[PDB]
Design an enzyme around this catalytic site. Sequence first.
Site, mmCIF file in Angstrom:
data_model
loop_
_atom_site.group_PDB
_atom_site.id
_atom_site.type_symbol
_atom_site.label_atom_id
_atom_site.label_comp_id
_atom_site.label_asym_id
_atom_site.label_seq_id
_atom_site.Cartn_x
_atom_site.Cartn_y
_atom_site.Cartn_z
ATOM 1 N N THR A 76 0.831 -1.166 0.056
ATOM 2 C CA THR A 76 -0.099 0.083 0.121
ATOM 3 C C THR A 76 0.809 1.204 -0.001
ATOM 4 O O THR A 76 2.080 1.261 0.141
ATOM 5 C CB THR A 76 -0.911 -0.175 1.293
ATOM 6 O OG1 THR A 76 -0.123 0.172 2.431
ATOM 7 C CG2 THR A 76 -1.675 -1.323 1.164
ATOM 8 N N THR A 77 0.225 2.359 -0.238
ATOM 9 C CA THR A 77 1.015 3.527 -0.149
ATOM 10 C C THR A 77 1.093 4.368 0.953
ATOM 11 O O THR A 77 0.218 4.462 1.975
ATOM 12 C CB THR A 77 0.036 4.698 -0.906
ATOM 13 O OG1 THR A 77 -0.185 3.708 -2.472
ATOM 14 C CG2 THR A 77 0.749 5.631 -1.308
#
Lengths: 249, 208, 101, 234, 246, 250, 242, 247, 241
Positions: free
Chosen positions: E33-34
């Site tokens: 994920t970011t």
Amino acid sequence: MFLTRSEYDRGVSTFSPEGRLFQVEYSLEAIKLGSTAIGIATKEGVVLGVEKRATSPLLESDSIEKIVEIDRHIGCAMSGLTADARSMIEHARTAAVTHNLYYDEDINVESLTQSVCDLALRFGEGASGEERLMSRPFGVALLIAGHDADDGYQLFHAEPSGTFYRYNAKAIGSGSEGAQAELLNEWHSSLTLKEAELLVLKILKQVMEEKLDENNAQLSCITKQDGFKIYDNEKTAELIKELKEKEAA
Amino acid sequence: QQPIVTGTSVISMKYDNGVIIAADNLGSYGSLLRFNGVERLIPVGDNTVVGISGDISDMQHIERLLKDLVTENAYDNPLADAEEALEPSYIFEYLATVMYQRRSKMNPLWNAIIVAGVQSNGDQFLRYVNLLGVTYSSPTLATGFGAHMANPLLRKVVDRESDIPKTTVQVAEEAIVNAMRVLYYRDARSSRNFSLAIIDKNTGLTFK
Amino acid sequence: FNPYGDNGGTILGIAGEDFAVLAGDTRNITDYSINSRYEPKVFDCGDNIVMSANGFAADGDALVKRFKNSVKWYHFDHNDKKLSINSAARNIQHLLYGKRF
Amino acid sequence: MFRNNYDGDTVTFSPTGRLFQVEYALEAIKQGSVTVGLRSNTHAVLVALKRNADELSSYQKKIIKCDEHMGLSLAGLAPDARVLSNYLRQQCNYSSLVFNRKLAVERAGHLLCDKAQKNTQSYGGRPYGVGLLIIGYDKSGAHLLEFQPSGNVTELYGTAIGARSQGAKTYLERTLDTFIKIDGNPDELIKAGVEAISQSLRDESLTVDNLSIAIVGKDTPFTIYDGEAVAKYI
Amino acid sequence: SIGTGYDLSNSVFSPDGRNFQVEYAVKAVENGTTSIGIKCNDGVVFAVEKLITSKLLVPQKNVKIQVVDRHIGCVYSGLIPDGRHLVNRGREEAASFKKLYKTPIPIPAFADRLGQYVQAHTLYNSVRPFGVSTIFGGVDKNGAHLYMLEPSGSYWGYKGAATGKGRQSAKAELEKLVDHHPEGLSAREAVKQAAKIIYLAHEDNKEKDFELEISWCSLSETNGLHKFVKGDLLQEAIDFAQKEIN
Amino acid sequence: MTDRYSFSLTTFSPSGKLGQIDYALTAVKQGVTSLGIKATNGVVIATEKKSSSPLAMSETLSKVSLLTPDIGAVYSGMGPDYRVLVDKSRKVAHTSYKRIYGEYPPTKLLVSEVAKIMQEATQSGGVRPFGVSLLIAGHDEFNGFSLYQVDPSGSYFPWKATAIGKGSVAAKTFLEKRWNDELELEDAIHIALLTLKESVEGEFNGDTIELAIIGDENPDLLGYTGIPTDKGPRFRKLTSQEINDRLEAL
Amino acid sequence: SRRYDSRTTIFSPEGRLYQVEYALESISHAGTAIGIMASDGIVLAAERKVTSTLLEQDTSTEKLYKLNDKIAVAVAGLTADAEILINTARIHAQNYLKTYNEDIPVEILVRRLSDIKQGYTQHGGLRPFGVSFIYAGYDDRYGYQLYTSNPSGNYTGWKAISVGANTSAAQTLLQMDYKDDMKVDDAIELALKTLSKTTDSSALTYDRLEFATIRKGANDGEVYQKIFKPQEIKDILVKTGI
Amino acid sequence: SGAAAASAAGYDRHITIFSPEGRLYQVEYAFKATNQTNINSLAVRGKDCTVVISQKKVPDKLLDPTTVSYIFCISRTIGMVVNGPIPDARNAALRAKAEAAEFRYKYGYDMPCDVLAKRMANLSQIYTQRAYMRPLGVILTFVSVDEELGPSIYKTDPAGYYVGYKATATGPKQQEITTNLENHFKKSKIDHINEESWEKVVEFAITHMIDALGTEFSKNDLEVGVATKDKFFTLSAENIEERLVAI
Amino acid sequence: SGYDRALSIFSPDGHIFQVEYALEAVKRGTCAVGVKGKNCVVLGCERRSTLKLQDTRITPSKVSKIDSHVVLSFSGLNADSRILIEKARVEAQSHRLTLEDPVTVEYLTRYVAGVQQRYTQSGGVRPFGVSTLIAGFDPRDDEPKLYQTEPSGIYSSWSAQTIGRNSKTVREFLEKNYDRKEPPATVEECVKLTVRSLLEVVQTGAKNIEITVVKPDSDIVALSSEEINQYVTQIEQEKQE
């Protein structure tokens, strides 16, 4: 992919993509060798029974001890790799005796069976964060026939993998698959002691290569009152001829 | 061991809505009285305090880790401001079992530790432990000569378990402050100074 | 240096025929100084057992806390077995004999 | 359809970053049995299912206690569950000795995300081929979890593990509005799990012996229900 | 896969002076994920896409930020546990920087006790490197700081950071700001200006719903410590964000 | 083709031979030329300095090095396996012999304490050996002058006049064309540089060469005049100009 | 077959450890070493391979060695692994004398020092020694003695042996002219003949060789580790008329 | 043929294996790592003042260029500049900075760059004996202004080789530079360089790594060090604005 | 194959191999034999004397004695033989120290075995290519006893055994000539049963034999070569046929 078992086989700590590790499943195949064993439980008495694989006519067959004492109210059998037994049982008794110090009482039977199974698991971490002592998971598949006050007469099947079961009528070793179906269909919950010793001296006949006598077999029976005793030869020969006197009629 | 820079007594009492504990501010070297800027009370959170006596070298060693204990509570528990925070019983056992395992090693801490505060339900809490690790509790406690002089006094205010909610704060503060007078009147190593801590299950906390 | 001293107390406890009891003081003293008025000394240690440590206080509590903890490992292992007294006759022989020196 | 290397130790990576022996561990669950769990605002529970060898043989432990505000339900390789229980039986006992507190369940999974990662880095050792749940009622409300060998844990309103499961999770994806409001009435919550697990079977009919339950609550300790004391829910 | 021989192990060197197992770990961060962190005139704000795989997960208590001793934070993007293994070394040594020096650990001296540790894994043979790239910053005597950690052992000082699969995107919207605002954002617009990004960075994964998380450290609004968010502050920041992109 | 009895050391091949030692002795033969020959009243130890670039000060590092005042050395082959060796050789005089005998050792008991520092690294995998060689040369007062070689295997062949490195046999071919029995040092010294004019390319001056001697005591190097018996060193490195005249005498 | 050659603990199906036998061809590369047992004093002998001209082959004995005033050795094998277990032997004999205050017998250290060479053919990733010996001793229990130790750990007591290269003939030549009395000076004149007739060269100089002698021959009985110098083998060497 | 039997028959993944050519190859493959940045430093002597220069690239804008630096003040009177990846530069930097110290705790003064290049290089040998550690893929330079020797440069490589140059550069671009001061020295025959001030000697060394490097440089693309008695430090940006005005 | 290298790992059958491969190494070694009656136990071993230079007063005798009341033989390879004895007799002698009652023989053989079942557990160690035979009475008892060890780490009790080379001839020879329920009852008879058990495989030599017997009262004795030639030759009369 076909090379799933060919390469992931030998190292113990290699998951194969089918989820499974093989070098334990082969340990299970070891005890399929060796000489068979049986254990039947009752409300009145637990009983065992084995063949012996008469190898030569000059040996003194009181020596190979497929059955042992382990404490006054417990007794074992084993249908596997031999030398890896005497590393087992000299631990298994040692708990029962040690237990008689720290708690002053005849140990239960399952806890003993849980101490063993927390020993063969030492190709890895045991319970209490221990590290290792071996790399050869060994085939000594046991039958722990015992008595204790909470639950009466018991037996178990303790395997190298650690997981065990409270079978009621088991038979392990080479003559298993022909037997463990035969004992599947002749185990009431209301048998006697001697309605079992004859039984286990009938299956053992048909399943084993040679004929049956006193020499190529023996058996044992614990009891809450007397204890573990390995029966005598002439006592066993009593039961063998008794059987024939029942068969023909 | 054997200490040099040894402190002096402290005092406690429980009451209806909370507790009161206080000390003096002093650092000795013998008969001499070198330091008088120190404290004796190390707050922890907003429900709890700890009074200290004995060797001031070790009192610095207590405050170093309690601040870290609460710190390592905050790690990975966002909930732990409200209810999963440090009530005192979460603490005192750390300052008890440290000590028994520091006595049997034979290099102890010659402090005498008092703990006061309140749980999350709202009930009183107070307990005590010296260097050997022994523990007890009662509605009013002291240390050193404070227990040989002022504990009998304050028990006249608070005899036993019954008369605890027969009491308030204004009467409570006006007892130990008169026990403060005694020690500055007669105690050998005391000092005129003071440092107070009250707790209330409703209004919370304050300080000197 | 002295690692242990005295705290007082004086206890007693009896067996009947189909019962028993145990009695213990409820005061703690340092050196003719009432260290407190009510601090208990006697504990239901599970599996309907009672015990008491009269003498030095800390050791009289740390011993117990090992017994309240041994009793449960006796249940986790041995599947909720009720722990008889004969067991604790010589279990406690060991907790203490681990400190002979 | 050919050999690959890089799939022989947890030490090594793929040429893309897929650690393999973890991707092969958590396939192992798919040939261990089923067990499910549920949450509410005031009660937790979990349901299990047994498997045997022959009808003489006794059944296999599938729930084990760890401390009276926790438990777990395994699904996988048992010898690597016997351990982890006997790791957190200690920690949950450590705390009561030193702090006299109840342990936070969400700092138990955090203690299992670690131990399952140490084995994952270094040569020797295995990824613990197990998958197990957690339950309890500490001060922060009820709780439930869902462990994996990789380390990753999550909390949630009730899930399932093992082979023949997704028939359940599709159920529990429906009724999430319902079985969390269920408060102060255990005996109908428990009747959801037994209903759920029946969605994910292959002609088993759900005998008494085959089944085992655990439960906690507001003031109810970790108590399990196996055998003749379970036929209520059939 | 240039070298089929020089990848089975670590502690080797290719003919081109490379070691490729690091060059494969980095492809495990990309599948994550970011996560970002903005530098500000007083402190920092962190953020993350927190994906949700089912409807059954409890909100706001499967958190992903790990808070080190009150003045530095660390956020991950990659394999989480190797991460959580790492702060759980950074959360202990900093104490061992305190009990000798009594100051809270600064930020750089916290890095070199990580960036030097990670490099140890990538020179032995009986281990595996880390599959993370964690951001961390905070506040100290000499201002704010913000860094990136990367499994090669490198770390560098960033005004803006972004990792995961939303790398190529958020490395734009953090280039714009540092052209508009050289003078230093305040700590009550960067936040909502972060939410704008993670809602823009999601669009590699428009399939699945998700949840947004923030954690923020700056002197003015917090008095110099680390803290999560709650209430109108993030809710408006949500309301700010999905507005502007519709 | 390979041999599959050479990637490791503890493995015998059917000819009863071991793997990596045979290649280490090739690591030196690829290296530069160095030597040392002998005389009646002294010993000489020589080599050159194939300075890589022009900017490398070729004086901050000495092929030759002192072990005791009466004992000096030179290698041929690899370098870092020299200055890591001697730093744990001269010690062993000061550790195993000196402090329990008062005085510095003979020349051969030093060698035994080198060659097992050389053989500790050829008995367990996980250790490359020392891809070097040595020519230890010194003196003592019951067996006299001496010269000694030390290979990486731990064997120490003695010698009289010898060289090693790539330019070996060309030199060894030349020595006995010039070597004798009764030779003297200052006669044995211009030999040991006109030996080196053949195994060289380019410049042949003091700044591309360095060597040593052994002789009678050099008390001017000693430092503590005032004792009658402590005659000082027996080893001195010839400066540039002290060489750079002899060539013009040649 | 699947090649069982790579560790000395592998046990080929026929039961035979390969990597030990290899050592027993790592010995043929060595330089011959002979010892004959007289009736009144053992003799030993030797021969060297490398004999270039410009190296001091005068004082340096490389094969012949002592262990104490009673015992001598002649090696045949690797030289890195001779110092290791000939200082150990010295260190064993003294540490017997030191704590029983009488001299070492031969059958002890040969029994010991060979079990050491068995402690490496069994465990660890270790190698077995490439070494052999020819012991030569005296002791009250048996008097004169001769013994031998392979690179395995197996030892045997003898009357006359050659080790190293070309023993095949050098036994054959020996066993068909060894009388059983063989006064000491009549033994030397046999040992040279074997080396004279077995070697590869034709020179058989004074420099290539060394041969020593044990002697009880003195009055007021005691032992004499007589080692011979270059100057007197020449007398031995001209006297035969090579 | 060169590495064909190398790349096939092992010899390129274990450190401690020789080839029949004698060459071991792993360490000979380490040096390819030194050039993985495309970076190119420099160093020169003085009358009493020493200098070292490095590029400092212009990557994406998000960095904080205050911290990007390959110049590490080790102790006083000492400094160093690396050629290689950053992480494998720290572990050398830090194994040193805790090594000059204990000396000063154990011998009563500060180490020179002599020993500091002989010590740290007496270690990278060892790690090419044992399998403790892959040899650090660097080649590092040291500087100092010593009391007994004056200025001094030294250099260290992953094998252990060390020599004290008079002036040098490093990186992918040595031949271009090194000639543009090798030819300079044969002019004057001075191991050192004139221009007493540490100021005026910088502008010498800048311009030589402009004409022979291949482009023009601003203030930001560089970072520069200096060594003077009692100190070691870094610098400001005006030194070039006071160059091109003169030209 | 692949499963026939190490000790740690099994076949897909169950067989562990290396142990099975040691016992092939036994059979590349000279015979041995052990017989018991009632007042006697015996042992035999065909040696060699195939070399003339070798001195013969210290002839290679398989036999070794652990205590007064115990003897031993072996097979296999002898570099290992010296070890087990040198740990065995240590243990017997560190027993009466610790207990002042000498070894029940069943205590000894569980320590010669025990040293074999530790050298078959972990890689990095080799087994023993060896297989023994024990013979000795207890203190204060008459019952004659005999076991054998084996590198698998097991052991059994035997009334008559033959191991080493060509044993598969000598066993069946002893399956007739013996009978468990009527043993030999005299110290001559076990020897004659024992000598002609060697004569099947031993080229009718008589210098190539060693016999050593054992009895109570801590008795042991080796016999004389001239005491064999009359125990040899008198048989040859009995096959004058």
